[PDB]
């Protein structure tokens, strides 16, 4: 996932360059795992909104004949209704009337009475086919973008068959199902998938649009730098690569624009980069600021102030907090016996 911030591993050189040489990172996760191909496909998700506790409808037969007796009672002592729970994970049935609380098979089950015993498609129709785009490097699929554009990588993804449908559980916990994902692990059953509600969709689309807005703001900055033949140091904060990877770093030193090749490593908490108020951790030791300028728009504060990255923006992090809080896993029923 998109980190909160990206810090260079270590600054090596500072070679002054021309301003037109600037180029916005265009940061993508597809091309960061080495997947520049992108194909359109149709995957499967849970039905939108709270989709759990299937509550299967059935009847009890008191001693194929039981189906004739039930159809006759609609228009052997049939006792109905006998609504039972279903764990969608293994197509499991749940009720204390079952011997030890669980019946798992496949069209008929048992009961705590040997004289009275207890379709399966309508209750298990809990999926929507939706449109997505998978990133490919030839045959390999690095990851996919869902319907509302959020990119999930398959690194850390397992296999998990919800309600008799082969699918995969992503690293964050969502569940999709498409043809040939090339997954190998199989997902210890204590791992859970998440709800698919419309708030999830809205917040995801908001993070998508926030990222595209990042790149468009960068492009606007460069477009102004060209027709202005001048560049403000704080505007350099727009040219940071948002994801970890090999990129460039920029600074305005000695009155000129300088760049360097550098490796961006993750920053998901502010405290790591500035443990000591005054210090900015680049590598092992803190690096020295000069003349009221650090790099990438980070400033030495004029007076009684300290290294100030653009931590005032805080709009992507807001929507990612809203996303991380608004997810809820789908747990199993309770097993109740006698």
Numbering used by the authors: 1 to 63, 92 to 103, 132 to 162, 167 to 178, 184 to 403
The authors write:
Glycoprotein (G), as the sole protein on the virion surface, is a key factor mediating lyssavirus invasion. After receptor engagement, lyssavirus enters the cell via an endocytic pathway, during which the G protein undergoes a series of pH-dependent conformational transitions to catalyze the fusion of the viral envelope with the endosomal membranes, thereby initiating the infection. The lyssavirus G, which belongs to the rhabdovirus G family, has been defined as a class III viral membrane-fusion protein. Similar to its vesiculovirus homolog, RABV-G also consists of three domains: FD, PHD, and CD.
We also crystallized MOKV-G-ecto at pH 4.0 and determined the structure at 3.2 Å resolution. Three monomers were present in the asymmetric unit but were not arranged in a trimer. They interact via crystal contacts that are unlikely of biological relevance. The overall domain-arrangement mode in the structure is similar to that observed in the post-fusion structure of VSV-G, as indicated by the extended linear conformation and the proximity of CTR to FD. Helix F1 is unfolded as a preceding loop, orienting back towards the PHD and FD domains. This allows the F2 helix to be arranged in parallel to helix C. Consequently, the CTR loop is shown to extend over domains PHD and FD, enabling multiple amino acid interactions between CTR and PHD-FD along the interface. The CTR residue H397 forms a salt-bridge with D143 in FD. Finally, hydrophobic interactions among residues Y145, L257-I260, P394, L395 and P398 also contribute to stabilize the post-fusion architecture. In contrast, the FDs of MOKV-G1-436* were observed to extend away from the central axis of the VSV-G trimer. These findings suggest that the complete post-fusion structure of lyssavirus G is similarly characterized by a straight-linear conformation as observed in the vesiculovirus homologs, which in turn indicates that we have solved the structure of MOKV-G in the post-fusion state.
